[PDB]
Amino acid sequence: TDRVSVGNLRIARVLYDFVNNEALPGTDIDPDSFWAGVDKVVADLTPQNQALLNARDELQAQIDKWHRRRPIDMDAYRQFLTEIGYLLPEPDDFTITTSGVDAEITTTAGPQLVVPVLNARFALNAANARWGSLYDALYGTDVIPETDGAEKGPTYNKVRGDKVIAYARKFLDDSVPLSSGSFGDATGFTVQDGQLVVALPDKSTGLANPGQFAGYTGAAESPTSVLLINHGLHIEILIDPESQVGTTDRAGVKDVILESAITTIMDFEDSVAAVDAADKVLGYRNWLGLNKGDLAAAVLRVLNRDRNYTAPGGGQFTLPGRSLMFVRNVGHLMTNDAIVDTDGSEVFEGIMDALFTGLIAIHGLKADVNGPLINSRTGSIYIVKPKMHGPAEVAFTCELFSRVEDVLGLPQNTMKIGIMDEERRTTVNLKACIKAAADRVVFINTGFLDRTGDEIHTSMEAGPMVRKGTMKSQPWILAYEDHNVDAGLAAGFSGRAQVGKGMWTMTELMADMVETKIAQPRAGASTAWVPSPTAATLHALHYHQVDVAAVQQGLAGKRRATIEQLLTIPLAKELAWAPDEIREEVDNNCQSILGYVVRWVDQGVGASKVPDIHDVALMEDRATLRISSQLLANWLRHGVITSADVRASLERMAPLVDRQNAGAYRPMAPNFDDSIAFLAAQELILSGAQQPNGYTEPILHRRRREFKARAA
Numbered sequence: 042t043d044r045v046s047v048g049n050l051r052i053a054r055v056l057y058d059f060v061n062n063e064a065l066p067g068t069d070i071d072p073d074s075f076w077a078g079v080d081k082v083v084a085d086l087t088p089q090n091q092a093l094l095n096a097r098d099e100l101q102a103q104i105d106k107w108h109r110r111r112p113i114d115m116d117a118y119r120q121f122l123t124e125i126g127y128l129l130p131e132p133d134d135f136t137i138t139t140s141g142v143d144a145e146i147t148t149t150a151g152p153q154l155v156v157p158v159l160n161a162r163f164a165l166n167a168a169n170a171r172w173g174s175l176y177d178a179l180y181g182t183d184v185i186p187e188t189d190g191a192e193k194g195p196t197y198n199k200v201r202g203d204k205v206i207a208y209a210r211k212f213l214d215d216s217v218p219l220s221s222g223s224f225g226d227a228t229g230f231t232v233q234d235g236q237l238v239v240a241l242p243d244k245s246t247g248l249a250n251p252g253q254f255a256g257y258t259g260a261a262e263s264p265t266s267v268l269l270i271n272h273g274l275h276i277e278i279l280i281d282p283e284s285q286v287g288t289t290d291r292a293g294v295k296d297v298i299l300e301s302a303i304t305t306i307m308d309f310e311d312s313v314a315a316v317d318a319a320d321k322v323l324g325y326r327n328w329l330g331l332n333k334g335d336l337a338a339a340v341l342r343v344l345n346r347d348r349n350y351t352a353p354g355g356g357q358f359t360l361p362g363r364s365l366m367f368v369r370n371v372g373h374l375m376t377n378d379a380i381v382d383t384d385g386s387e388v389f390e391g392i393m394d395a396l397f398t399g400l401i402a403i404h405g406l407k408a409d410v411n412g413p414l415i416n417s418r419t420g421s422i423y424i425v426k427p428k429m430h431g432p433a434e435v436a437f438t439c440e441l442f443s444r445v446e447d448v449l450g451l452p453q454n455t456m457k458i459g460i461m462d463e464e465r466r467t468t469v470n471l472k473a474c475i476k477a478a479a480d481r482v483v484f485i486n487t488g489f490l491d492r493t494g495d496e497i498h499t500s501m502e503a504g505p506m507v508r509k510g511t512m513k514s515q516p517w518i519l520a521y522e523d524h525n526v527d528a529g530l531a532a533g534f535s536g537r538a539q540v541g542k543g544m545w546t547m548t549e550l551m552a553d554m555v556e557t558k559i560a561q562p563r564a565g566a567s568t569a570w571v572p573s574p575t576a577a578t579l580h581a582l583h584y585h586q587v588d589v590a591a592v593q594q595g596l597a598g599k600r601r602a603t604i605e606q607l608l609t610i611p612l613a614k615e616l617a618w619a620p621d622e623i624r625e626e627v628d629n630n631c632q633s634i635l636g637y638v639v640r641w642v643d644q645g646v647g648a649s650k651v652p653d654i655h656d657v658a659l660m661e662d663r664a665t666l667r668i669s670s671q672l673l674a675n676w677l678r679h680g681v682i683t684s685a686d687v688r689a690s691l692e693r694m695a696p697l698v699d700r701q702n703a704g705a706y707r708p709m710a711p712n713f714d715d716s717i718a719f720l721a722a723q724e725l726i727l728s729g730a731q732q733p734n735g736y737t738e739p740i741l742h743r744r745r746r747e748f749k750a751r752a753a
């Protein structure tokens with residue numbers, strides 16, 4: 042209610058003051074001009090942000106009418122989408138021209154960690170996760186089974202530590218082979234002639250490929266750590282025979298450190314509840330501390346500094362201590378009262394984010410004002426833009442970034458774009474979307490969770506969908522994943538840009554992650570998303586076993602996905618399911634909505650571990666909420682289930698979600714109809730069909746605001 046008028050804009054004062062007193066000092070931008078430019082960018086690109094948002098509903102309306110009129114003529118289907126401007130012609134082959142891109146993106150294949158920018162500790166850890174102890178990763182997770190006396194105890198279990206050490210020596214054997222013998226046999230390491238030599242219990246061998254020896258610390262004659270490289274990622278053997286772990290170790294190894302989270306996406310979108318100017322500032326403030334380089338916590342944990350090594354021959358070089366940081370703005374749909382206009386119309390959140398995260402990112406290009414730590418050593422600003430539907434929304438984002446770079450005084454194409462392939466209209470037009478961003482594009486990623494949501498909502502009217510667990514094997518999603526890699530490699534992404542795959546959500550099943558997430562490097566993705574620093578280092582194993590660049594060479598030119606397979610709607614069969622299976626699917630989805638929503642609405646937490654009805658802790662975000670809510674809406678709109686069926690499941694799941702929590706937590710049960718979060722969940726399902734492209738934000742935002750408001 043207390044705002045600052047600049048032009049047609051009414052800036053909430055908390056935002057204005059933050060920009061003026063915290064973000065703008067050090068950017069060379071005079072606050073007068075910046076706001077005047079903000080007002081100017083808002084006023085003129087709001088029309089096209091609104092046109093594009095209008096195109097989405099009218100395309101969807103035409104599709105909904107087509108299915109309801111109508112046993113499905115697929116040639117006619119694809120022709121209709123071509124006729125309404127949903128499917129557009131493929132452009133002809135081209136190479137992306139994006140320049141000034143950090144090497145972690147162009148060349149390096151490895152994990153990419155995603156973290157809510159609103160949690161400064163998490164963001165701190167994510168930035169520091171560029172380096173991760175393989176030992177702590179293995180010890181702390183189920184990768185080493187708690188069996189035969191290897192169970193995690195309140196104190197260090199030396200049986201567990203041995204399987205840890207043994208596992209890591211196996212890894213080193215597969216990544217950096219010795220000419221003869223194994224690292225398990227190693228008794229010590231020295232550097233001679235610029236070449237690493239390892240002491241065995243009989244002879245002394247070297248590296249199979251000595252070029253994998255990348256450096257060391259300490260004296261040549263007994264390093265405190267040897268630095269190894271494999272497939273562009275560094276491995277560090279910490280050597281300390283006096284350390285407790287090193288004392289037991291054949292070679293005095295204290296730890297093996299993996300280069301892990303090569304890049305990190307600091308997220309303003311599906312993993313945060315940022316509903317108003319107060320919420321947005323907390324996130325912008327964290328983004329500012331990360332770009333300054335002085336973000337810190339007590340309970341003093343700092344951002345890591347760079348790591349220095351002696352080069353194998355002479356030299357004293359330096360590797361990045363922290364993960365190269367992206368920011369994920371919100372998409373184009375949502376609106377935020379942080380800025381209202383003269384007439385009360387909220388300003389578009391995506392525009393605001395581009396200017397504010399853009400402005401703040403200026404500090405991360407220098408190192409004393411701007412703070413001491415550099416993010417991009419190439420002057421690029423990395424914004425992944427999510428939920429774009431089609432190439433005209435990409436073009437608008439590039440124009441948007443163009444205008445922001447004007448207001449901000451940056452050269453053009455400073456603001457690079459990570460395109461989320463995660464709406465159906467981007468999938469079937471992906472090559473045109475990359476073209477629309479040919480000079481700003483820096484990755485594509487299959488947002489397979491939002492993409493499933495878009496899939497269900499687009500063909501909502503076609504009939505019941507398969508159960509959610511079944512989507513992973515549907516023709517459309519398998520073509521979607523292969524198509525994304527193809528189009529990226531056809532666009533020149535190899536060595537120029539990242540081809541990225543989606544998020545491992547089972548944060549407690551690391552053994553399974555180590556077993557199955559290798560499929561993503563093996564399919565040619567140069568990065569894949571991990572929810573956690575620990576997961577980053579474990580998923581880093583996979584880039585040591587799979588030569589991602591070599592996989593992408595072999596995939597060149599191959600077109601493994603037809604337009605017809607991309608358009609295969611995941612409809613369920615005839616007799617479908619037993620009431621058995623139906624109820625399981627309803628209970629499962631209702632408990633995943635409720636568990637996620639209650640923390641979103643009552644505590645403004647956008648990313649929660651939520652056990653499903655098989656007691657598997659799932660890291661849940663808005664995208665997973667969108668699937669669950671759209672699938673029940675679809676099952677509802679076709680009579681697979683009843684509105685009272687959905688309420689009964691919500692009623693019976695609420696107490697079990699209540700007992701999955703406690704704290705600061707507010708019990709949903711028994712006063713269901715007067716718990717705001719409960720009604721938010723119910724409305725996400727009962728009104729799921731009505732939301733624009735099934736997005737959950739409109740209902741989540743307004744219910745969060747209303748919860749905040751009843752905290753009067």
Ligand SMILES: Cc1ccc(C(=O)/C=C(\O)C(=O)O)cc1
Pocket residue numbers: 155156311312461463487488489490491492543544546572648660661662664
């Ligand atoms: C913990 C977490 C963080 C981010 C995401 C997410 O953004 C996925 C995608 O963008 C997409 O699969 O839709 C999921 C879980």
Ligand SMILES: [Mg+2]
Pocket residue numbers: 311427461463488490491664
């Ligand atoms: Mg997504």
Ligand code: NI
Pocket residue numbers: 588
């Ligand atoms: Ni190899």
